[PDB]
Amino acid sequence: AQKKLDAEEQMNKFKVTGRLGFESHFTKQLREGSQSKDYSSLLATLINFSPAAVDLEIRSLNSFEPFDEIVWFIDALTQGLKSNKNFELYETFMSLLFK
Amino acid sequence: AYVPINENSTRKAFYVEVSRSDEIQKARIQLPVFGEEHKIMEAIHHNDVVIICGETGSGKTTQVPQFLYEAGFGAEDSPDYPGMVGITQPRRVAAVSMAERVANELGDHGHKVGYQIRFDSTAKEDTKVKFMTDGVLLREMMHDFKLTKYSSIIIDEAHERNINTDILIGMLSRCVRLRAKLHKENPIEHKKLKLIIMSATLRVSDFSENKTLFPIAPPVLQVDQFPVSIHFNRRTAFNYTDEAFRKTCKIHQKLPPGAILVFLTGQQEITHMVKRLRKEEGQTANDPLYVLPLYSLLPTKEQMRVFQKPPQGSRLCIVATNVAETSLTIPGVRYVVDSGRSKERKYNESNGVQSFEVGWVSKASANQRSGRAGRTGPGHCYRLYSSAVFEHDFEQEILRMPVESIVLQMKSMAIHNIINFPFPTPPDRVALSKAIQLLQYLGALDNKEMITEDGKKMSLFPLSPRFSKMLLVSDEKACLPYIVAIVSALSVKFYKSRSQFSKLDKFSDVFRLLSVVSAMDYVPKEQKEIFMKKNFLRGKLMEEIVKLRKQLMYIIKSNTSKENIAVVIRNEVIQIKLLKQMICAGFVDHVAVRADVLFPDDAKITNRTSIINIPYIPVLATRTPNIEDCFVYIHPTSILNNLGEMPPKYMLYYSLHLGGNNKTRMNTLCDIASTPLANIARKGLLLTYSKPLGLKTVNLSPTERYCYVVPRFGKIGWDLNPIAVHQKKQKGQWTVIKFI
């Protein structure tokens, strides 16, 4: 019960009224990538994220019974390795899914 | 099955019937239903559902359960013990009185017939007739979904088209296949479960040859009185209550012996007529009269003294509702008094309120009432209305009402699949879906269609789900007498007098209407008349609105959502910010959002005397997708019309309507804030939520994880300020348990 209190206190401490877009740039670039059916512009964003951003990003994938985001994201990586560029990173984006 | 009980019962039936009780068999063979007995036995053998159509006093209800039962007793197959007969009745008094009469027709032989109703019931063994209410069988279907523990199901009085009898018939389409030898969609054998539909002569073809016929019944039997003369108000002399009393007195002196059956509207006028004939040249006839009240909530229907003909020298008068029209049959009647009035329940689909109103009787009902005087001798029917009122007022709905109340109710009788429920004329499946979407928006159902805990409270409440929710919110938010009156009514300088009673800064129309009632209850004596003149009010409607308030409290306490003070159920600066949240809880998802710079106090230019602010607003809603982003404006009857300088930018409405100049108008409105809304849209599918997003989020585990949540609404859905929320990720989902 005492351990719940620290989280409540941090939330109370920060009450910024600033509004940040409801849909993040990532999920929005995933969404346009899937609709377009070409992620070549998507994967150019995944190179330029920080490693700090990528763990925050791939954990933040909408997973549900229909599984739309995960299947969109795998089809980015398969379309990556067909281009053969950046063979190191796209397999680590693959392995980071399975963790 | 058990063989030694069978041959014991087979022997005992023949011993009693042949040589101990052939005097009420003579009475049974005088009923028209006996003439077709053998044919009914062969018809149920060859056909697994059959329909018996029969007019008032045919004997269908009393005799047909006995015949099939006696047939199984006299036979090696069907044996006695596989014989379990269940008989559906629409009204409690009919189920008790038919069971008691059938018991007298079978003597002291043993438990052969009983009844089973809500709170007054016995079980039964194998070998047994059971008269029960429709809503008993619908509750039993929660454990016996396909009716395993009964061998024949008799649906009586199906012509009245009660919601339960229509539901059971649609369920029978689903049920008859898997008990009755349909093995994987193919018909392989003779259907084990037998069914009998029984009906009066009112739209027999809805149940014997219509579009939705196929699960009802393929063979039809029509089972057939002395002349009953028809008199109308032209040949009678009786204008009102104490005049109906004058009539009972008139046919005492003339019109030689026989019982008087007085059809009245309902319990309130039953009470006044019973008093006029017991505490009255009036007292000349008190002691010569036996006056009996008859109603579904009174014990008389279950007592042998009503069906008993009176002591010598005394005239029997029966003061009854529509219960004596088809459900309860008293054989000594010769004089029928028809008031032409009765009560019915109307659901208004756009208003969400169920009303219980005083209607006029149907042409069919009036003729059915005439047939209650022709059983013992030639009789007379005294109709207390003009022959013109027979033509115009008297009728000779499921396709023209919003259906949300019914869809929610069917799930308490265990009828989950609404689309699979047949009726004599089916509704559109678009209507059925729209009502489910409304129920899902309120959170009465989940987004897989299953009943919620709130939806169960809402189905036990005797009013539409939107306003049953509004009452339940007034429990929590401590404003009960105010809200119960509002909900009751919809179920059933003059400018500064208006702005004084609005009470600023409270701009709520609904709170305003209570503040008018609080002011009405503050104008005692002669001040009442000059108050209603000063403030442009309707005294009589204010009295009705107050009468409905009490009702809302009586119903909510009886559904166990309010406390009671010594058994009694009572409806009785205000938290104007709390009230708007509760109003929002009933009007959700109908939300509108006002937009700068054209809507606000920028438009304060110039029109002298009657200043007009010019309002740029669209609707924001997800449960009415077709009004999403639609341009709207206030109606001129609404007080928000032409106003500026409002404290929030968000409002909710009941009704939105397009009229002259194509300006889509909101008829009635209330100013609401975003934090009140948030919780209102958290019920289910309508609220749109997003992933967590600076501020860190602490996750205790897989489920437990708190973070800022960006909830969306809704088609068009607007965004909203993030709400620190506790989301217990259940079933791999971040659903918000509570707003922190």
UniProtKB/Swiss-Prot annotation, chain A:
Intracellular or extracellular location(s): Nucleus, Nucleolus
Gene: UTP21
Extra remark: Present with 2020 molecules/cell in log phase SD medium.
Protein known as: U3 small nucleolar RNA-associated protein 21
Taxonomy, superkingdom: Eukaryota
Species: Saccharomyces cerevisiae (strain ATCC 204508 / S288c) (Baker's yeast)
Taxon lineage: Eukaryota, Fungi, Dikarya, Ascomycota, Saccharomycotina
Function: Involved in nucleolar processing of pre-18S ribosomal RNA and ribosome assembly.
Domain topic, free-text comment: The WD repeats are grouped into two tandem seven-bladed beta-propeller regions.
Binding partners and assembly: Interacts with snoRNA U3. Interacts with MPP10. Interacts (via WD repeats) with UTP18. Component of the ribosomal small subunit (SSU) processome composed of at least 40 protein subunits and snoRNA U3.
From Swiss-Prot, chain B:
Further remark: Present with 2000 molecules/cell in log phase SD medium.
Assembly description: Interacts with snoRNA U3. Component of the ribosomal small subunit (SSU) processome composed of at least 40 protein subunits and snoRNA U3.
Ranges spanned by the short sequence motif DEAH box, renumbered to the chain: 156-159
Residue intervals of the Helicase ATP-binding domain: 41-220
Similarity comment text for this entry: Belongs to the DEAD box helicase family. DEAH subfamily.
GO CC terms: 90S preribosome; mitochondrion; nucleolus; nucleoplasm; small-subunit processome
Parent-protein residues present: 361 to 1251 of 1267
Function: Probable ATP-binding RNA helicase. Required for 18S rRNA synthesis. May play a role in restructuring of the pre-rRNA.
Name by which UniProt lists this protein: Probable ATP-dependent RNA helicase DHR1
Subcellular location: Nucleus, Nucleolus
GO BP terms in the entry: maturation of SSU-rRNA; maturation of SSU-rRNA from tricistronic rRNA transcript (SSU-rRNA, 5.8S rRNA, LSU-rRNA); ribosome biogenesis
EC number: 3.6.4.13
